[PDB]
Design a protein around this nucleic acid. Sequence first.
DNA 1: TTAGAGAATTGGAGAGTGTGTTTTTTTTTTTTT
Lengths: 35, 703, 639
Amino acid sequence: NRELEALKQRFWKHANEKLQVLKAKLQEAMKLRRF
Amino acid sequence: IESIENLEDLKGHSVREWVSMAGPRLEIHHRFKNFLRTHVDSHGHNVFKERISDMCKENRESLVVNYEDLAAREHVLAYFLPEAPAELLQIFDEAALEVVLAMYPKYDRITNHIHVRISHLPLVEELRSLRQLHLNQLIRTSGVVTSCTGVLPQLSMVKYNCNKCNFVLGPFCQSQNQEVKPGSCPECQSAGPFEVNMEETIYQNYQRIRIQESPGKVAAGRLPRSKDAILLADLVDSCKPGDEIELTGIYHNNYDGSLNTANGFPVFATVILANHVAKKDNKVAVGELTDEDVKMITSLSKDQQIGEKIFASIAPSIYGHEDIKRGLALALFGGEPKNPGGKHKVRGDINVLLCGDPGTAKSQFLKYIEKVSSRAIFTTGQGASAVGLTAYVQRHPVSREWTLEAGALVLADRGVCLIDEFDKMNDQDRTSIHEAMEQQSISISKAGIVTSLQARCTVIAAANPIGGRYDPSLTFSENVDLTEPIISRFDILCVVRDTVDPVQDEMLARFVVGSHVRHHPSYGVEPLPQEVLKKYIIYAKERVHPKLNQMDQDKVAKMYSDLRKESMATGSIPITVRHIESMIRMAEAHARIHLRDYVIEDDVNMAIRVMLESFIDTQKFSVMRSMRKTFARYLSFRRDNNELLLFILKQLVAEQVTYQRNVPEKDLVDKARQINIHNLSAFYDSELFRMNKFSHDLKRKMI
Amino acid sequence: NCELLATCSALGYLEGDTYHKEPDCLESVKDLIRYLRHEDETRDVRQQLGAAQILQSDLLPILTQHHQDKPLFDAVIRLMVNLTQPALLCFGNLPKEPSFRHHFLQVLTYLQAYKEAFASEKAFGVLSETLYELLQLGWEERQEEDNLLIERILLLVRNILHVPADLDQEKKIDDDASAHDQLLWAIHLSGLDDLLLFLASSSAEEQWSLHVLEIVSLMFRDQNPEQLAGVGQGRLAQERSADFAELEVLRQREMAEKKTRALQRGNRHSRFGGSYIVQGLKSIGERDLIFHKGLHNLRNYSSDLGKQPKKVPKRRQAARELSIQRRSALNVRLFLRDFCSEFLENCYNRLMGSVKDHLLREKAQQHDETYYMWALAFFMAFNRAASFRPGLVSETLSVRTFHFIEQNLTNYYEMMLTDRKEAASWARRMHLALKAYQELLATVNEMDISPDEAVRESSRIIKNNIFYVMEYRELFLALFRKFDERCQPRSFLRDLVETTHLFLKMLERFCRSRGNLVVQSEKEFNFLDYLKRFACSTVVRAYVLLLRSYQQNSAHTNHCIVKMLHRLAHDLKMEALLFQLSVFCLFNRLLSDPAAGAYKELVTFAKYILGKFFALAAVNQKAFVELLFWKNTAVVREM
DNA sequence: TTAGAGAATTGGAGAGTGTGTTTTTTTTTTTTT
Ligand SMILES: Nc1ncnc2c1ncn2[C@@H]1O[C@H](COP(=O)(O)OP(=O)(O)NP(=O)(O)O)[C@@H](O)[C@H]1O
Ligand SMILES: [Mg+2]
Ligand SMILES: [Zn+2]
């Protein structure tokens, strides 16, 4: 399936709700602060 | 109150009560004070010292904080801010007041409260996507303002006179939820018809706006959703009906019996408590410009090739059309309105007409001007009306009295009105713009309304000739189908042709294919970046005002006289008196491009060149060459004057050699200021001294 | 508030799953204990620390992750015992006024939150490990340092088990893990249950017998012995099929009632008019009745079709049962069955002997005999359920336990009648005593059934003793003649009736088998003249009061009621005592029941007594007036 | 063992207070005439 996976890779190459995302990625920084 | 080393451990609380209690409140207060005092940008410059200083210079009572900076510098405040926005914004306002009164101890005379506004919040939401999950949270939305109340006074801390005795009831806080009922007087227990003490009551500005989804973001054939938003204090008149805005605010809900009886279910009304309004039009205001920005602009103005750079920056993806780029640059920067004696107004805006063949980038030029300019209105042909262009009267939507409303020309009052497919309009729609084009006003006498609105805009129109192909066998007047009153209202009148020329076709093809390569999703002089150009434009328009001292009246007067003669001869274009005032306007526009506070003969010669070249362009083929030699030999295409400085240099060298035998650059420039040939940089770039083996150096000053 | 906030912050903070304690934890915890000791009577510090949730956020992490730091661990255990102190101890009673009751509800809410938090297995694992490594030492090796720690550990477990279920979250449906079920599962997985079995079986550590009894009581608070003893491997299929069948039964009953109502009203809308004169029926005046409620209603006309019922005044409002029964989680039920089995086999005799020694020596709190009587009822019922072995409970089978229970029951009866301001509480204590007495009387029957001639001999001995002594016979009449619906629940009335039925069954069989004439300075006796004491109006009034709920009663309860009334009617010829108008209304409901076939015994008895009444009425029309009132010896004048 | 006379508590009748209400024409504007 390597050529099929290569076609998948080409389509991924051309490939190019958020409060919880914000809080998580900020939670990492405050954990680093405490450490 | 001991300092709290970890705000992040809520210890089972929710954010609202956790920040409402005293310990975390003081910790948040100190953290925000420290953030304001110590936050620095990538260059190490303390940004908030500058911002607070500008706010106190201009008495603005409001401080915009970038959420990206807050999140980068102090994490937990950015963490708690969207969760409990009212509480943390109150704490931020207190802390900002402390810092402001540390910087300016006497600012309490100007304000008693500093409003912290939040910008660039990542919690962007579509209006159609707001849910109950966003309630009491700081959201950010986009839309077009479709309604606005007048700025109304609202009770904020109200006091009531007792209905019998002379006592005054204590301060009650207004909530946005319901009317505050006083209760009963604590001196005597009466509860009768109480009345507001106007003098002791504290009021605040109130304005209720309605925003809806922008018409290009709604689907075709689908009705737009809308929200009410409350603007308080210095946020009032941040926008007008028609403005595209981004709105950061608290999404708030309260019980409404009217909605409950309308729906049959306990539905709660919703409103946005606005915290920050930013017009998507004015991405950069004049107040947003930093000392770095204005230093960049002023230093960039000293390049001395800046005119060519500014011209080249007009639509950098369009090959050629240097005359179009020149005319559009002059129109975009604009002249100065004048009113000698207070009784004779003359417009300062420059109007442009691009007529010519299909596939010649006229519409692309118009869309570029739309993108780059603040306050751009774009309209097309049959899509416009007389009424819609100028102004329209309607029954008011709720109260049903006749009310006047702003058309495109009024909405573009200090901006650009762009009219594509200009020849395709109706005559009745096209004649509406005459008053706005010349007198810069729109006078309406309809349904009891009798008034004149300001329409001081610059009109940039695009058109095709008759049959959709320009004919060099005929003059402009013979193939345009427009009439003299509208033709004369356009200062700059451009003809664009698509004639075959193989070398130019090859270069144009290479430029176009290179553009398609460059812009994939992934002339000589070099342009500015478009961000820098926008900042430069607004600085040049708002912070600079050219003034004309002299313009060598004989030259322009003789030019106008024989331009009138040749226009009467060929019939190509009416010249009237407007072309003279177009000369003054174009000179002021070029001075503004160079950021000159005073107009000079450089600018006058530029304006002269633009007028003469466009008039020559209006002619037929055979007539065009004779007209070229006529106006070129007799009138002023003052390209350069190197010979005078050449022989001045030769004379000075000969005298110096004669003196020494039996600082020359200082000698040369002294003579160059004595004679009216002051533009010496052209001579230093030209070949005439170079092949005569002279040279220059600003340090050594030897030649 | 802010100073408490400062100390609570000074405890430390959690990060991910690891707690980072500050070095000043010891002095901050001592300060917290000082604030709690210097509380207001409103228990403000209790409310504030519960609101701050430091028990959930700091003390449990400290207890679970820094248990090697022994001074801090001891201080935290003492602080947690103080915080988990039950609300009834905090305020002394249920407050009678709104402000203290609001404070009581606040403390109770935070106690429920603590119980929710305490279901983590790690906390009980640490508690079991520290108790285990403490009890590993010999008793003589212990000092006040370790004995007080055992007291505080067991009191913490007691406090967490004691907490009432939240009224909000007690709506859990059967076969679901309530907070108490999760707590018991935490005890099971931590192995503290085995430590409780060890403490109960240990002769050396008998000093903690009352504590261990209270733990076991609060553990088995919700359970029923026979239902628990029936648990086993194959229960999932049984309970699933039973749930489906019961669902269909409920649905069919609702459909039948809906059809009956649809027939009672007409097939025309309510504003469809029409009025009738019922010529024979005089109205409240002399004019004929005008009927407006539709022709359909005149098939089963009654004058109370449109009447509002009456507000029962507060004093006359009947007592209601304090909790619904719910089938707990199957894992917890299996664990409790195994606990009860192993406890019964290994612990029960020594624990009950120790508790009786404590009560004799009078080094127990005021009402610990209630726990003793609870344990009698529960574990003897569980023993009789499944494999009955009297050796496992032989410490309880002595006549001294009968005497102790009878004394307690009479004491509670007197205190219920006199101490009127907590008469319901005295009634509940008396209910526990009654259930213990009932289980002893059931156990002797099981001993009779069992094959061992030795237990048959001792069963005969104890039966002779009990039936000889007078108080065991007179107590039933004493209870019936001053029972009150206003104070005692219908569950108590059920238990009293069933215990009376069992007691009279045994006494009748005993006297039928052999004479044994002398009773009580002795006197003669016979069971017929004993039964004639049950011919009073009050006892039959109570029996018909229980009969009113025949739809909801158990089949055994209905058999008890109808057998007693049949004994009084058929064998003592006292039908005129039971000729009553309210009883006849109940019989009218019984005969009109659509499910009357399910109550064949009751309707047959009702028709027997009704036929006797109508024979007497045909002979003499004054019987209709006699129906209207309760009576004394008009039972013979009518005859 | 029942029940009846005197004292205290609870049910509800009713007196008092506060709230809410009774197709038509001229003008514009876009599209269609
Ligand atoms: N000199 C040029 N350089 C780059 N692109 C060009 C040039 N001339 C035409 N084009 C392209 O031609 C296309 C059509 O441009 P457009 O502005 O619509 O033409 P137009 O002047 O409006 N003709 P018309 O709409 O019939 O009046 C665009 O994609 C332009 O980029
Ligand atoms: Mg076009
Ligand atoms: Zn007053």
